Amino acid sequence: SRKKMGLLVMACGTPYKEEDIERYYTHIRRGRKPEPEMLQDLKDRYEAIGGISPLAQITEQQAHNLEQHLNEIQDEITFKAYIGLKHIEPFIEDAVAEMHKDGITEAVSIVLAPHFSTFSVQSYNKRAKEEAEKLGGLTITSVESWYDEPKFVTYWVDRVKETYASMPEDERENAMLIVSAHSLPEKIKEFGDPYPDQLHESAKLIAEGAGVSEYAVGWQSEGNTPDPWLGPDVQDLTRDLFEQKGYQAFVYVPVGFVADHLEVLYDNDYECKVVTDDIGASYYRPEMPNAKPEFIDALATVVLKKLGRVD
């Protein structure tokens, strides 16, 4: 009969309603409650992007669709998905405890961010494993990165091809592709963290597959701490490249992100769009993966490869 496995799907998390913003951002800010002006600003940003409720729904849909798709495409394992989040319930440790309570003894985990880093992916995986160890009798094998899964590369390659094909001739000959991920503190370098190298490799692979010769790599959405974060930031990079070469279209591929959350809908589609509007360039940002079948199939392949059950 089929082996039962937990499928632990991990992510940063998102507020579920406007009244969750305070606690969610306090958590991101390591216990520092946002001041009233910042709370109001954040509410306004979420209103501007179309509201909060759709956001956590994406992550739930990704986990649910991944469970169902994994269960349909092979006949050896029955997976049950559990969501574990960093900054709001259900927390990672809660998800692991629920797996253990439900009788799961063997699980596979994946983080909804394709590049490994010490700051996020490794920390999530270690937290999950540490909770399993505390409870006993449950083991987890963890996906560490998946940016190089061919099906995932192809998702973005094909979105980029469609965007370039849609352009007027003058833009298609004078466009710049900006490939980005969430900035992290530069000090990850002290550990040899491969996160920057992996973003650069994503960009190489996507530009190569799409036949785009002119591209650049940037970072976005840095936090506010006294130590430096990876740069350049996409807003600065856009303006600098425009000053250097006069590109008249910018195409943003925020490959580090998997969903229509604040980082994409605001930090690209508002903040980068301010810059492109200021310089007179066209703005393009192809569809994020969200829970679409092509992306879910890529993730299912990642999981089955991690378990050795497909070549």
> Which residues would be at the binding site for Cl ion (CB under 5 A)?
116, 144-145
Q: Is 257 left (phi over 0), alpha (psi -120 to 50) or beta?
A: beta
Cβ nearer to Cl ion, comparing 83 with 302: 302
Mapping DSSP onto H, E and C, the string for 160-198 reads HHHHHHHCCHHHHCCEEEEEEEECCEHHHHHHCCCHHHH
Cβ nearer to Cl ion, comparing 125 with 248: 125
CB of 46 within 8 A of CB of 40? no
Cβ nearer to Cl ion, comparing 203 with 216: 203
CB of 233 within 8 A of CB of 220? yes
C-alpha of 86 from chain center = 13
Mapping DSSP onto H, E and C, the string for 276-301 reads HHHHCCEEECCCCCCCCHHHHHHHHH
The distance of closest approach from Cβ of residue 146 to Cl ion in the complex, given in angstroms and rounded to an integer, is 9
Rounded-to-10 torsion of CA 292, 295, 300, 303: -140
> 143 in helix, strand or coil?
coil
The distance of closest approach from Cβ of residue 108 to Cl ion in the complex, given in angstroms and rounded to an integer, is 16
The distance of closest approach from Cβ of residue 104 to Cl ion in the complex, given in angstroms and rounded to an integer, is 25
The distance of closest approach from Cβ of residue 205 to Cl ion in the complex, given in angstroms and rounded to an integer, is 15
> 260 in helix, strand or coil?
coil
Structure tokens at 114: 């394709």
Cβ nearer to Cl ion, comparing 115 with 159: 115
Q: Which of 122, 196, 114 is nearest to 153 (CA)?
A: 114
Cβ nearer to Cl ion, comparing 205 with 212: 205
The distance of closest approach from Cβ of residue 303 to Cl ion in the complex, given in angstroms and rounded to an integer, is 15
Cβ nearer to Cl ion, comparing 18 with 144: 144
The distance of closest approach from Cβ of residue 191 to Cl ion in the complex, given in angstroms and rounded to an integer, is 13
